Amino acid sequence: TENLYFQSMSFSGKYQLQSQENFEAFMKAIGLPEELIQKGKDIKGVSEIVQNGKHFKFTITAGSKVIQNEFTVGEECELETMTGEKVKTVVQLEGDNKLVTTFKNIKSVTELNGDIITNTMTLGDIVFKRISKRI
């Protein structure tokens, strides 16, 4: 048995969504009714992340829906996507401040630069970007 020691900043805390880039084309892309899209286009609430080592619990307010997932880094956990549905993907740790996973052709990056967190999902030529600050 080998031991691999890694380390990250600390993603714990609630983040207030401030800037959202390209919510429409991307939401519309994944196949979301234009209703929900329009019901959630400029809502900006709070998301929460509770990190304990590599055990992650995170609640997201995506438009008008509160999604809740859990994962462990490098472990194959199943997540619920923005829409009604479910996938299996592995979340990896890049550097000391990146969570990176790909699932369904969607590439998810979550960067933490100090007190602010940028979430970038690029599905093709579409780049959905959300910028929240810890509080």
Cα angle at 82 between 91 and 14, to 5 degrees? 70
**In whole angstroms, what separates CA 94 from the centre of its chain?**
15
Please state, in angstroms and rounded to a whole number, the distance separating the CA atoms of residues 64 and 62. 6
Resolution (A): 2.5
Q: 1-135, what's its fold?
A: Lipocalin (2.40.128)
Tokens representing residue 38 in the block: 């329009």
Which residues, at least 6 apart from 18, have a Cβ–Cβ distance to it below 8 Å? 44, 131, 132, 133
Please give the DSSP secondary-structure letter assigned to residue 55. Answer: E
Q: Would you kindly state where each structural domain of the chain is located, as residue ranges?
A: 1-135
Residue 111's SS3 state is: strand
Cα–Cα distance, 134 to 124 (Å, whole number): 29
